[PDB]
């Protein structure tokens, strides 16, 4: 396949928590904040897959690993800046109440550049939270998107099997100074929610981000005292072997 306790938070669609890859290791929190529905993938397909990459028992990057699911995307994979902010806030609250140390948050979503989203991310980074987001799939400058455009959030673009920018529909991975690193984001094998022993291949900057989150989680097991800047210098160096 070509591609010390840490806690990984996922903000995404609902997830199929029973799936064989993630059952018993993925705590479904009860946070849910989603807009009303505005076509062929299931209502929990995006998040089940990403929980899979990252932490899946046999297909995952951090085969462990401890995960907590917050719901910020509806069946059509559509959320809101505001719902995302409240989810981020839910995470901060549980950081303060029930620590622990090392905390990773996966944000496999993007909207247009948002001052307030970027701010919440900044505030959460100051508390020592590792934020990992997609650069977005628009063959565009990532600086135009949020959370992709936030420095202090780790922004991940997608490469394919030959280490080239991933092509998506008539679009593809975002690029530019706002992208902190690239990671595998083409045909990534992980849990399908079609059935609880099904696996699906998916492409996008979500996948690349999920991969970086998994590696960040393992590094933080081995050395739970890395500073964000240390973690980032390590991830950059890790994504190299050329």
């Amino acid at each position, epitope marked *: 396949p070509w591609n010390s306790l840490v806690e990984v938070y996922l903000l995404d669609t609902s997830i199929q928590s029973d799936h*064989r890859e993630i059952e018993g290791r993925v705590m479904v929190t009860d946070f849910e904040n989603v807009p009303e529905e505005d076509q*062929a993938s299931k209502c929990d397909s995006h998040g089940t897959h990403l929980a899979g990459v990252v932490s899946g028992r046999d297909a995952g990057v951090a085969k462990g690993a401890s995960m907590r699911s917050l719901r910020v995307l509806n069946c059509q994979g559509k959320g809101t800046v505001s719902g995302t902010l409240i989810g981020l806030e839910f995470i901060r609250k549980s950081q303060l109440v029930q620590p622990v140390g090392p905390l990773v948050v996966l944000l496999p979503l993007a909207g247009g550049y948002s001052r307030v989203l970027n701010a919440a991310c900044q505030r959460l980074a100051r508390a020592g939270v590792v934020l990992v987001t997609a650069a977005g799939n628009f063959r565009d400058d990532a600086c135009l998107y949020s959370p992709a455009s936030a420095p202090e959030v780790i922004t991940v673009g997608a490469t394919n099997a030959q280490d080239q920018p991933v092509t998506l529909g008539t679009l593809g991975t975002n690029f530019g100074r706002c992208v902190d690193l690239f990671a595998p984001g083409e045909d990534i094998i992980g849990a399908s929610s079609d059935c609880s022993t099904c*696996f699906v*291949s998916q492409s996008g900057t979500s996948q690349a981000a999920a991969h970086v989150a998994g590696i960040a989680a393992m590094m933080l097991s081995a050395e739970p005292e890395l500073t964000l800047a240390e973690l980032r210098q390590r991830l950059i160096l890790f994504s190299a072997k050329d």
Partner: antibody, heavy 131, light 107 residues
Framework: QVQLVQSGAEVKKPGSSVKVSCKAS????????ISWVRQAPGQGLEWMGG????????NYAQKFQGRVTITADESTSTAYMELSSLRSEDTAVYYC????????????????????????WGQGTLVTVSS | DIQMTQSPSSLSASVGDRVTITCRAS??????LNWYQQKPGKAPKLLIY???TLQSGVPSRFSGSGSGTDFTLTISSLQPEDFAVYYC????????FGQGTKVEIKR
């Protein structure tokens, strides 16, 4: 005349490892998804894992994670099951059985369904663990 | 994983009997249940998959029924070679088996 033929009986001292093979034979294709399912004497059936050559990964049973590795020799239509840190309790007949990786993707996608329908076994291999 | 409870452990019957074994899942599995027959010293043999459909070349006296959580295997008119152990297994899943039912000769 399509069949799965396993390696022979083993005896192992506690704390060592066993490697049992399962060779596929007599069809046009013989590279298959293979499961291992054990039965201690007088007891019932217990799935250990499977190798899925299309998906390119194994799936291990939670009770055996860390003790079983399951591989396949790409040249010889043969799948292996290696169990280590043997203990008396591991004394059992070990069966291989074929399961399927069905392409159920639309549009597509690219969805591999692992369907555990054990139509074809596997004659069994007795592994005895004793000091 | 998912647990399967099979009932009863043991059965006595005569050729011509209608026998029913019953099998129960710890949660809903639609109809992702398989039935096997096992005779002494042999590998199990697939009889019924997906609750109710017959495996290739298996006699129609065998039938399966059930959905959700409670399942049934019925042998409608028992033959001398139907005396054996029967197992249910779910494949919803990460496969998991019932602890068996022995069909023995009445006398």
């Amino acid at each position: 005349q399509v069949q799965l033929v396993q390696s022979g009986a083993e005896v192992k001292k506690p704390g060592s490892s066993v490697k049992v093979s399962c060779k596929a034979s007599g069809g046009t294709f013989n590279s298959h998804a293979i499961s291992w399912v054990r039965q201690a004497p007088g007891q019932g059936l217990e799935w250990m894992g499977g190798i899925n050559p299309i998906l390119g990964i194994a799936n291990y049973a939670q009770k055996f994670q860390g003790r079983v590795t399951i591989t396949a020799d790409e040249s010889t239509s043969t799948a292996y099951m290696e169990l280590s840190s043997l203990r008396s309790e591991d004394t059992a007949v070990y069966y291989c059985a074929r399961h399927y990786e069905i392409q159920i993707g639309r549009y597509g996608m690219n969805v591999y369904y692992l369907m555990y329908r054990f139509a074809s076994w596997g004659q069994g291999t007795l592994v005895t663990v004793s000091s | 994983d998912i647990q399967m409870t099979q009932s009863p452990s043991s059965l006595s019957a005569s050729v011509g009997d209608r026998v029913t074994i019953t099998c129960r899942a710890s949660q809903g599995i639609r109809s992702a249940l398989n039935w096997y027959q096992q005779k002494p010293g042999k590998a199990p043999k697939l009889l019924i998959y997906n609750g109710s459909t017959l495996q290739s070349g298996v006699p129609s006296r065998f039938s399966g029924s059930g959905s959700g959580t409670d399942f049934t295997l019925t042998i409608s008119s028992l033959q001398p070679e139907d005396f054996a152990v029967y197992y249910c297994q779910q494949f919803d899943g990460d496969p998991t088996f019932g602890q068996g039912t022995k069909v023995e000769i009445k006398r």
